[PDB]
Write an enzyme that holds these catalytic residues in place. Structure first.
Site, mmCIF file in Angstrom:
data_model
loop_
_atom_site.group_PDB
_atom_site.id
_atom_site.type_symbol
_atom_site.label_atom_id
_atom_site.label_comp_id
_atom_site.label_asym_id
_atom_site.label_seq_id
_atom_site.Cartn_x
_atom_site.Cartn_y
_atom_site.Cartn_z
ATOM 1 N N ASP A 136 19.654 1.386 -9.659
ATOM 2 C CA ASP A 136 20.400 0.120 -9.415
ATOM 3 C C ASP A 136 21.379 0.170 -8.209
ATOM 4 O OD1 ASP A 136 20.754 -2.741 -9.915
ATOM 5 O OD2 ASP A 136 22.422 -2.323 -11.308
ATOM 6 N N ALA A 196 29.289 -8.701 -21.373
ATOM 7 C CA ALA A 196 28.288 -8.065 -22.234
ATOM 8 C C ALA A 196 28.374 -6.526 -22.329
ATOM 9 C CB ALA A 196 26.886 -8.506 -21.823
HETATM 10 CL CL LIG Z 1 31.872 -5.034 -26.286
#
Ligand SMILES: [Cl-]
Ligand SMILES: CCn1c(=O)c(-c2ccc(-c3cncs3)cc2Cl)cc2cnc(Nc3ccc(N4CCN(C)CC4)cc3)nc21
Ligand SMILES: [Cl-]
Length: 297
Positions: free
Chosen positions: A145, A36
């Site tokens: 994160d 993604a």
């Molecule tokens: Cl992409």
């Protein structure tokens, strides 16, 4: 901004990037991942021979392009020894490329999952992360994160933070954030219990990453993330499997990272002074674990 137009997004990236085609600068293309966020390669600077990591993104298939612009701008203006170096970026039509130094040692996750770190080696990793965190926080950047996956390792045992896709930039005017952006198991309890958190959420996560280095996993990893978040908010400071196996000064360090009370939790600056970091082995001590994990993985 999320409402910013496709064409205003492109014009802004055009201003950021170097001109022309990145093949005009690189050669060793091995694809080392995809998904993604884009496709990642290792490659070689043609000119210098430096091994690099390159992410290729198609902007058409990119849902949140404000965050890509933000990530590059943060990297560019927050260079540090303990942050993976941002080298260059290119835009060829809808195709965006971001070029980074490559750390041939892989992820800390590999190390924690395949080897057993000693407290000397743990202290050295925590020190190096706290060096990046002190620098970020003082520059009003919250990583948000922090977890073993986002720590990268050189073959010399260099320790570098990566993946600033979720970072926040704060000001004295708005010093607190509320967005729940981080990976569930590493999230500080105040991210779910309040709507106002600051830099010390990265210290909490750092503490969870120290549990990974001791035990191999963050607490509740086997839980569905939705349950883990309720569990963090309701259990508070996570319990160690075998606390008696740890030195007193390491247990003190963990308690300072994983303090429920944000005021009492150490800042990165305070924790750089912690005596646990004084038992740090040279970072070269990590090289057999890195090589053993590379082998297993
Ligand atoms: Cl992409
Ligand atoms: C984790 C892969 N990786 C990176 O993704 C990036 C990266 C980070 C941020 C950005 C930015 C995008 N937009 C703005 S900034 C772009 C890139 Cl390319 C850099 C990077 C550097 N070194 C490495 N090294 C590395 C080497 C090996 C492995 N392994 C271990 C062995 N397994 C078998 C496979 C994967 C993981 C990471 N990976 C990187
Ligand atoms: Cl390396």
């Amino acid at each position: 901004d999320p409402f910013t137009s496709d064409e205003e997004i492109l014009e802004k990236l055009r201003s950021i990037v170097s001109v022309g085609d990145p093949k005009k600068k690189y050669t060793r293309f091995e694809k080392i991942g995809q998904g993604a966020s884009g496709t990642v390669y290792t490659a070689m600077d043609v000119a210098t021979g430096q091994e690099v990591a390159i992410r290729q993104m198609n902007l058409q298939q990119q849902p949140k392009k404000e965050l890509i612009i933000n990530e590059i701008l943060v990297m560019r203006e927050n260079k540090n020894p303990n942050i993976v170096n941002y080298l260059d970026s290119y835009l060829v039509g809808d195709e965006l490329w971001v070029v980074m130094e490559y750390l041939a040692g892989g992820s800390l996750t590999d190390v924690v999952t395949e080897t057993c770190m000693d407290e000397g080696q743990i202290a050295a990793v925590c020190r190096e992360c706290l060096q990046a965190l002190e620098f970020l926080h003082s520059n009003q950047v919250i990583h948000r994160d922090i977890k073993s996956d986002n720590i990268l390792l050189g073959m010399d045992g260099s320790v570098k933070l990566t993946d600033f896709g979720f970072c926040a930039q704060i000001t004295p005017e708005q010093s607190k954030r509320s967005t729940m952006v981080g990976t569930p198991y590493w999230m500080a309890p105040e991210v779910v219990t309040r709507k106002a958190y600051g830099p010390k959420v990265d210290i909490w996560s750092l503490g969870i990453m120290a549990i990974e280095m001791i035990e191999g996993e963050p607490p509740y990893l086997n839980e569905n993330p939705l349950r883990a978040l309720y569990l963090i908010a309701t259990n508070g400071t996570p319990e160690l499997q075998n606390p008696e196996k740890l030195s007193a000064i390491f247990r003190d360090f963990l308690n300072r990272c994983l303090e429920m009370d944000v005021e009492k939790r150490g800042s990165a600056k305070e924790l750089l002074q912690h005596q646990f970091l004084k038992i740090a082995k040279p970072l070269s001590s990590l090289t057999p674990l890195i090589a053993a994990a590379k082998e297993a993985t």
